[PDB]
């Protein structure tokens, strides 16, 4: 009997006031929340934000919507949500968000005989995540999603994670290109602004950057170039062309790396550790070339001094580079 | 009793004329404003603007909305804001603004027994900010947000900062990786257009650009290449091919750095500080190459003069470059 269902639904909305929360003027209304992470689209270090798509479900109880005689859970059309009171939940750290609307608006309203309302949305949100890039690419980030009621204080509404630690699902199936989600965490608290205290839910992810290929891509070529620059100290002065070739090649390669690879790296004007390491290697190869130039200059008049300088350089340069690497790793690992 | 509140709200909204401002035809309505800054997402010199996210709150009084018998401040659903008079506040220098609308429109309406209305929005605005890049990247910018009433003159509405200089908060939340907030200022005034006088509020920030990234990426490579160009003097002047190759390599590397350092900057006609430094380094390497060319031209008949010219260049060029750097860093700092 669909006529009886229509009559009951019309009676439920008869005299309903969307401007008044459930139990207005009384105890706070408790709202439980679930999030199903469909995907995490991209994580940006330039824009300091990440994009995340989710099924966001809210659960609450409204006694004005309690119905009897229908032994079913009424899944209604989404437009019915326009005639009902819904919580003013929003995300504090979002920069842009939308609810999908193809083919219809991605929204679900489900009523229960006792007056319980389940309200589901499908939301793609870009959320800001400030990142400490000082240790890039050896860094580890912590990106949060914040959930709060915009207008109602703790005297009116309350939030909690429905299901405890199982409120948020689908994290383990998320694959990120340059990050691996080590852990996720759920927090509930209260936040005080000048207008009062509001409930707050937090969903945080700890991201560890995949270092397997970063070492082999941006560090190994520089270290090999520095070693090749060292190699020039073991060549006799009669083979000056080889020394000139090695020195010029290493210096030009380091200039090209500094100018281009860092451009390929995120273009945010930040001082990372990789930049310091590349600059150190560049300075070392430049010093090696200058040492060769000095040896060549003083070669004719004082061959013995040139030989002594080369022999001492063979020891000094690797030792100084080892000390520089030790300090760099101590200060960044 | 929720029915009493519902009937009181209906009585308040019965006969309410949204087309007429409070005290229409009489004294002006005083509107106080508060801003709680969430973040400044980005500051762009190419587009000459900055993105700002804020909680914008307005406080005014409407005697038509005064209610009695309910000793509470009614926090109403934001949709009722569509049925009340609100000030026509706009931002003169904005280019693209919106009110966040997930899950609902981030809007707050609060009524008081005395008739006072508190109206809050969460707004992201891309406000224009013309910048002077003559000292880039050692510059200091000043970006403002202008708040005005469009249709109502000073005989109809008044603007003031509620709370004095404590009307804007969240300044410490601003974290720009390239800038640093130095000072923020609040101004109130009147602006006269052909249609009359209007109230005006102004929130201004002074930003100072960081220099470490530019030191590591632009100045140091140029200095190193300039120092490399001086090795040509210490080479014997008979090795014509080697010295020519070294000079040409330095010139080409300088030009490649200059062409690759276009960066995210507008095509301004004036000369920036970085442009001056790059031109100076190019002038130095060009002068070194020209000095070698003169030496090669003249040494075939007067070897003593050529040797003297090389010996004097070895001292003149570093000293002149040191003087140039001293002048540059004393003028621009």
């Amino acid at each position: 009997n669909m006529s009886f269902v229509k009559e009951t639904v019309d009676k439920l909305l008869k005299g309903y006031d969307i401007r008044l929360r459930p139990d207005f003027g009384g105890p706070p209304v408790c709202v439980g929340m679930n999030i199903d992470i469909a995907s995490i689209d991209m994580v940006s270090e330039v824009n300091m934000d990440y994009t995340l798509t989710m099924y966001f479900q809210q659960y609450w109880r409204d006694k004005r919507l309690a119905y009897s005689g229908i032994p079913l859970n009424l899944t209604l059309d989404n437009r019915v949500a326009d005639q009902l009171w819904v919580p003013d939940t929003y995300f504090l750290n979002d920069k842009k968000s939308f609810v999908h609307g193809v083919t219809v608006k991605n929204r679900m309203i489900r009523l229960h005989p006792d007056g319980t309302v389940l309200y589901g949305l499908r939301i793609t949100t870009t959320a800001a995540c400030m990142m400490d890039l000082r240790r890039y690419p050896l860094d580890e980030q912590n990106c949060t999603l914040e959930i709060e009621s915009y207008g109602y204080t703790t005297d009116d509404i309350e939030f909690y994670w429905r299901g405890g630690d199982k409120a948020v699902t689908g994290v383990e199936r998320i694959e990120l290109p340059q990050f691996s989600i080590v852990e996720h965490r759920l927090v509930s608290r209260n936040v005080v602004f000048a207008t009062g205290a509001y409930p707050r839910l937090s969903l945080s992810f700890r991201l560890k950057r995949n270092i397997g290929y970063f070492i082999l891509q941006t560090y190994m070529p520089s270290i090999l170039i520095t070693i090749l620059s060292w190699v020039s100290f073991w060549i006799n002065y009669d083979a000056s062309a080889a020394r000139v070739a090695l020195g010029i090649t290493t210096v030009l390669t380091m200039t090209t790396i500094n100018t281009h690879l860092r451009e390929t790296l995120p273009k945010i004007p930040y001082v990372k550790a990789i930049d310091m390491y590349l600059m150190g290697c560049f300075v070392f190869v430049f010093l090696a070339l200058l040492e060769y130039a000095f040896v060549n200059y003083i070669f004719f008049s004082q061959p013995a001094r040139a030989a002594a300088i080369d022999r001492w350089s063979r020891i000094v340069f690797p030792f100084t580079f080892s000390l520089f690497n030790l300090v760099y790793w101590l200060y960044y690992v | 009793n929720m029915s009493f509140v519902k009937e009181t709200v209906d009585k308040l909204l019965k006969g309410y004329d949204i087309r007429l401002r409070p005290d229409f035809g009489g004294p002006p309505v005083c509107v106080g404003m508060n801003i709680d800054i969430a973040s400044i997402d980005m500051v762009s010199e190419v587009n000459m603007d900055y993105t700002l996210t804020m909680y914008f709150q307005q406080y005014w009084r409407d005697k038509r909305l005064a209610y009695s018998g309910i000793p509470l401040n009614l926090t109403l659903d934001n949709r009722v804001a569509d049925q009340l008079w609100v000030p026509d506040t706009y931002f003169l220098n904005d280019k693209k603004s919106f009110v966040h609308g997930v899950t609902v429109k981030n809007r707050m309406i609060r009524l008081h027994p005395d008739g006072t209305v508190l109206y809050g929005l969460r707004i992201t605005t891309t406000a224009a900010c013309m910048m002077d890049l003559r000292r880039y990247p050692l510059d200091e910018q000043n970006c403002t947000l202008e708040i005005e009433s469009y249709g109502y003159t000073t005989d109809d509405i008044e603007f003031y900062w509620r709370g004095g200089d404590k009307a804007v908060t969240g300044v410490e939340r601003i974290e720009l990786p390239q800038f640093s907030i130095v000072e923020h200022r609040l101004v109130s005034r009147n602006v006269v257009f052909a249609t009359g006088a209007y109230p005006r509020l102004s929130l201004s920030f002074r930003l100072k650009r960081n220099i470490g990234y530019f030191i590591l990426q632009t100045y140091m490579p140029s200095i190193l290449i300039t120092i490399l160009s001086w090795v040509s003097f210490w080479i014997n002047y008979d090795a014509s091919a080697a010295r020519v190759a070294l000079g040409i390599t330095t010139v080409l590397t300088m030009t490649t750095i200059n062409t690759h350092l276009r960066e995210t900057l507008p095509k301004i006609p004036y000369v920036k500080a970085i442009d001056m430094y790059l031109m100076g380094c190019f002038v130095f390497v060009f002068l070194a190459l020209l000095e070698y060319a003169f030496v090669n031209y003249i040494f075939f008949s007067q070897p003593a003069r050529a040797a003297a010219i090389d010996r004097w260049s070895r001292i003149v060029f570093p000293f002149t470059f040191s003087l140039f750097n001293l002048v540059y860093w004393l003028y621009y700092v």
Partner: nanobody
């Protein structure tokens, strides 16, 4: 008198450090707040123009320099850390990590 509060650990997740003082017969009261990165400072009117706040990232220490002490400035002090999205600045409930009580008379 000069108070120094040294912080160690995940200081990037808590970029704001604040100072509070508790009267012997009252509740805690805000004193000042310092941002770690920008060095921006915020002060309360009751102790303004008398106290200065700075920070140094070499050791991650925030310094509160106190000048022109008065008998009204007798309270037990606390140094606290605030999260990035923790909300208001003048309210002790929004601060997660605290320090140890310091007596000044």
């Amino acid at each position: 008198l000069r108070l120094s509060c040294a912080a160690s650990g995940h200081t990037f997740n808590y970029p704001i450090m604040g100072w509070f003082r508790q009267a012997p017969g009252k509740e805690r009261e805000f004193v000042g707040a310092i941002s770690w990165s920008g060095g921006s400072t915020s002060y309360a009117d009751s102790v303004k123009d008398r106290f200065t706040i700075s920070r140094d990232n070499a050791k991650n220490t925030v310094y509160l320099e106190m000048n022109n002490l008065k008998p009204e400035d007798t309270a037990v002090y606390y140094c606290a850390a605030k999260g990035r999205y923790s909300g208001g600045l003048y309210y002790p409930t929004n601060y997660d990590y605290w320090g140890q009580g310091t007596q000044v008379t």
